[PDB]
Amino acid sequence: VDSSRRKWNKTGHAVRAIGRLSSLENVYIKADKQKNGIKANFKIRHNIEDGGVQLAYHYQQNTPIGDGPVLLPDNHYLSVQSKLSKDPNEKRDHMVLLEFVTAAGITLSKGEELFTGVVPILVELDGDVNGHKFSVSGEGEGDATYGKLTLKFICTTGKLPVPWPTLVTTLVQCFSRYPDHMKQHDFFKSAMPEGYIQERTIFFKDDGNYKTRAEVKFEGDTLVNRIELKGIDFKEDGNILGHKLEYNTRDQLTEEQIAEFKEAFSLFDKDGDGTITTKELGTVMRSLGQNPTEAELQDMINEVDADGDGTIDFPEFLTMMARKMKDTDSEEEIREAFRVFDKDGNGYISAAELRHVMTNLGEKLTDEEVDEMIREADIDGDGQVNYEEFVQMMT
């Protein structure tokens, strides 16, 4: 490569480095004290079909509905993982949405109490974009312990006149997971049950804007998000009215695979508080016969610890487990997993070894259920699981 190409590479690397650094779409929150609430600013990148991105610049204000005291936070952010899919049995225009949201950015009430378990959610939106009126209704549930939202939305007026992904931020941030050390900065939950008003302007670069106002509050045991949206100045053949935005990707974990990981997570998180501490991680590792030091345990957690709280929460765990792996590395991971099961290292996992491994993990199973696991894997019928049989179960 000549000196010219060397200069392209060098300068290309620098420009691509900025791209990678700034690929974040986090929700930046600050206090708006004179309105007794908060403001937020963030940038959504909507993938355009067949390449490119449509920027959506979000400006947000929240103010409490009630008169009682709320918590006004220091600067921090929310980080969001979204998965959009379709219900194969649904003929109406619709969106199935799975979302994990966590707070971070700050280093180590009666409202919070309303979010300790699973909470039913209702969403109603009436919209008007360039004169095109439409409504959406949504239902599902939130589980703030895991920063989790699962909802299904239906366009109740027929065909949605804008792309589903453009409505996602508009369609309940009280379901975000705030770590313990940030509980004093959780405005959203502190305003409950009376609720808050959420207002946004969303500017679509080189296109129109949405203006939204929403009431977010409890009606009985249900968290309700009632929204009005007004969109103006949109181009008839732009990305929005022209439906040129990508709905989702195939490279996303199934909602079912995510559930499997949540199950696995629970084996570590034995008190169900939504975290794995060094204590909990060490307990499982010691049960399996390993002996990590306290420094190692702290280090292992720190490595995947996005919010810096010193523990692994479920979205952090999911991020680690969704990490895409080289086939050679995948093979080594499975090979090493086999050794954990195969306690005496003779190359066969016996029914007894499997029973003990289940017990070590805190997986409660009858001996019969363990024999059924053996049966599932046992190709040659010797009543035990060899390496190749185990490989099939990890594949």
Q: Extract the annotated binding site for Ca(2+).
A: 269, 271, 273, 275, 277, 280, 305, 307, 309, 311, 316, 342, 344, 346, 348, 353, 378, 380, 382, 384, 389
Residue among 169 and 225 whose Cβ is closer to a second copy: 169
Residue among 241 and 276 whose Cβ is closer to Ca ion: 276
Residues numbered 272 to 301 that lie near a second copy (CB under 8 A) are: 281, 284-285, 288, 290, 292-293, 295-296, 299-301
221 near a second copy, rule: CB under 8 A: no
- Angstrom CA distances, 271 to 115, 119, 141, 302, 316, stand at 17, 20, 22, 21, 18
Residue among 47 and 184 whose Cβ is closer to a second copy: 47
Half-sphere exposure of 283 (CA within 13 A, CB side): 13
Among the listed ranges 89-97, 125-133, 189-197, 366-374, the one in contact with a second copy (CB under 8 A) is 366-374
346 near a second copy, rule: CB under 8 A: no
Beta carbon of residue 278, minimum distance to a second copy (angstroms, whole number): 11
Beta carbon of residue 22, minimum distance to a second copy (angstroms, whole number): 6
359 near a second copy, rule: CB under 8 A: no
17 binds, among a second copy, Ca ion, none (CB under 5 to 8 A by kind): a second copy
9 near a second copy, rule: CB under 8 A: yes
380 binds, among Ca ion, a second copy, none (CB under 5 to 8 A by kind): Ca ion
228 binds, among a second copy, Ca ion, none (CB under 5 to 8 A by kind): none
28 near a second copy, rule: CB under 8 A: yes
